[model samples]
Target: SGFRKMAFPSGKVEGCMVQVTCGTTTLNGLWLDDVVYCPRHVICTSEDMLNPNYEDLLIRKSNHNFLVQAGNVQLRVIGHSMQNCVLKLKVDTANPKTPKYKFVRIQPGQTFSVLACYNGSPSGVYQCAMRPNFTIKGSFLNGSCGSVGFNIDYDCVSFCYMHHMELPTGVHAGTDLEGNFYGPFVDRQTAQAAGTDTTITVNVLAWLYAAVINGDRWFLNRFTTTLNDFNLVAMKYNYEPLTQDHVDILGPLSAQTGIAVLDMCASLKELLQNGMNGRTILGSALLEDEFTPFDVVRQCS
Candidate 1:
């Protein structure tokens, strides 16, 4: 019955679930932040820097921007006379189709969450609705959205998209970790779980290398992680597009939890395996269109 949009933060921030305390009535609103907001509040109020009721992921107050390493993206709704809460992945991040942010029917003390991603394409906005189709479902590249890249004095790196990418194809890109370039339209493959093992190596924009879990994921510089702290966000890429609006989230923190699209190739078995093992992962194999969620051996090109 109420609507509001508040902004928070100005630096590279990361952490797991934080707590939030809503007003007396139920809370039915999209999370708009420099960082993702998970509503696990009500009983108690919190004030933690890592996770706060209001914080920024890629927001720098001085520069009006910061960074947030992404993980499980979610949407939570609350209501009255309800036993549990409703959750859904927002289709339109800027303006949601359904109002009320998903009509919740909470029994006065329950909650739920919608799976989300570090999707800054449409910006940090959410509308409510029924049956929210999360990007986790792999909506194709949903592809062919053009390409982009950037390089300036302070930072130097590029994130090239698929060139003339027609119909599900394994995609990849190369860029300077700390170098500059014109990058007007820096140009940009894959395999299936069963049919073929197609792996497309990408030259990420440095942030991902210093962000995610250190692995075979090739990077330009030799990176190192001190066993100093245990963090969930192992690796991440900050998308730094020109625009600073909600949709212009192209920076190290922009793609906070964004995964490599080339790995979208998934077979029924792989999905089932991951699901059975409760594996919440993101990839780029859906475009290949070789198999469905429950199909057998699939070849993602």
Candidate 2:
């Protein structure tokens, strides 16, 4: 029961970035059923997700909490005025009568990480809260002597690559008369049901690479070379699990290139190792797998 408008009406995809401006009250029901699902991993931060126009506000208008649905979650404080903000992780239980445990508290300039999954068990519900020292009284104006509303960023991992049998509306599929395959099916279930074979493989990263290259061509070959180089670097890193040295190299590269190098590298590694079966990656969880090939073409064009 909250008044704030829900951010993703169509339900956010995984591997996408979500940015929310904290209001005066707790953002309780900003997500559907108050559950922010992260299929693989979740990372929350005040740092700009990917946009250059985004400026980190110094003041927080209100305390905020993210009811995240995921196996692992990370919170990072990189804002200048976020020194007074108190970050906490709480266990959200099915029973409202049960007392939720405050498992971790992240101090300023610190990061809090948690893993809530083991084996094939379902992901747990955890709440990440940001409590600032002073909340603004009324409408906040620029340069006001109050805390500017803070921003919270998190991950959304996409499961589009996974094969599903139940096809939802608006998701299409096609079958080949021979043993070959054709047509883009939105979900795994639809592909399996429509395909000639019982088993089907969807290489999400490959599709993404093709989409980017094609989109680049449509954009007059602007990003083709850049994207190819990025893919090569990513593949080189994918050859092995990320090391501290890799992070050291990729971290600065990320800053200079405006790309989340570490995040993408980690995701690529995970994909190669774990095959994206109920997995999670770092940085913005949803930023990676939010769009389809068509959407990528449109955005790039």
160-198 per-residue lDDT for model 2 (tens digits) = 111011223222221111111123322122222232211
CA lDDT of every candidate: 0.20, 0.24
Clashes of each: 43, 25
The segments of candidate 1 whose C-alpha lies over 4 angstroms from its true place after superposition are: 1-145, 149-154, 157-162, 168-301
How much is the lDDT of residue 43 in candidate 1?
A: 17
TM-score of each: 0.16, 0.16
Candidate 2's C-alpha runs over 4 A off are 1-267, 274-288, 291-301
